[model samples]
Target: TLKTTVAADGVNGSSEKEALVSFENSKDGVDVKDTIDYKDLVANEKYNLTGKLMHVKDDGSLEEVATKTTEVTAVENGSGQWELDFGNQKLQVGEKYVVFENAESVENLIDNYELDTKQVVKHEDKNDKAQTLIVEKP
Candidate 1:
């Protein structure tokens, strides 16, 4: 499984601003992006789409497989969403990937919506697809 950060910092005063965004990389990628709403995150901040691919060990320690950082943007119809494409990268099942840091990325955007860090997982050996986590969200 790929551990994507998918987050960005608001570029203005107090971290009180509101924005929005949503992107996914199926067995692919979606680094990190922040928003008050899918479209609200635009022009409100210096967009960020940064993340790294990693594997969580049994002791809970994580290892970096590959690092990812998207190019910043500043347009009303801002940075486009792209899936986290772990293209050509190799990952195996049972070897999990997660990011506890991306938790608050959705704090203000999707009211009643939240990220299930463990929501998706790597399924098989090489090139195998990652199975989505069956999380019951609020």
Candidate 2:
């Protein structure tokens, strides 16, 4: 998940508001066209993977505001083979991150945009006081 700070100014002498937004992956609207054949990603093996971030707004509008990507390091375990390294990077509380498995998947996820795609997954880190997103092709 990508984390960033947003500042908004109030209108007519109203108090300004600063909020942290979190974007999550949509299970229904997700469409995976070009697949990524990662040899390391086994059928049952769990792989901690990270991808680009896409921000979703309250009006149902999606935007790729942050260029930062999530980080998932490899790990060994009985149930899950890989795990994400939360310490690899620092994320702000109440912030969100978007992930994509591959480049083509990110490209296809976007709507009418040439750059960043809109496909995203949402992760909520309540304990850390931050919002996270996990991107994957289903």
Candidate 3:
């Protein structure tokens, strides 16, 4: 199984955000490309997505190395997509973890809402598809 941080219930009456695509744990360092799909969101509603790239300490405490947030508009079909990208940030071996900080409806919007990372396959690994962790809504 891949090494991933556990998720807690969403805050402010929101659904828990899930990580679709995950990170690769290897020597050098891994690029960030985590995707979160909010398909069940309300139609045409704008939502805020926030995240934190955390570094775990020796005592299991987490320090915020970087953070990000973006606003996404739900489509007519009540589906929306959000991407959590840490610009120029990389998670090296021995130090790992990412968190969906928080999500809020924009415009003081309608309501509230809101990563188990998977091991990344190496380029030389001939698995066709990369090892990924996709957690469906529970």
Model 1 segments more than 4 A misplaced: 1-48, 74-82, 99-138
lDDT of 1 by residue, 32-101 (tens): 2322122334343343444354555677566776655444433466323333333343344234443221
**TM of each candidate vs. truth:** 0.36, 0.24, 0.51
For model 2 the local lDDT of residue 67 reads 42
Better of 2 and 3 by lDDT: 3
The whole-model lDDT of each prediction reads 0.31, 0.28, 0.41
Give the clash count for each candidate.
23, 9, 2
Q: Give Cα distance to truth, residue 39, candidate 3, Å.
A: 3.9
Best by TM-score: 3
| Per-residue lDDT of model 2, residues 2-94, tens digit only | 232211111011113222222232322222111122332222322233433345444544555334333332233211222122222233333
Q: If the candidates were sorted by their TM-score against the true structure, best first, what order would they fall in?
A: 3, 1, 2
Question: Model 3, poorest ten-residue lDDT window?
Answer: 119-128
Give the per-residue lDDT of model 3 (tens digit) for 1-138.
011232221111112433232333332334444445545555676666666555545575667766777766668776545555554444443443444335555544222251232112111111112212132222
Better of 1 and 3 by lDDT: 3
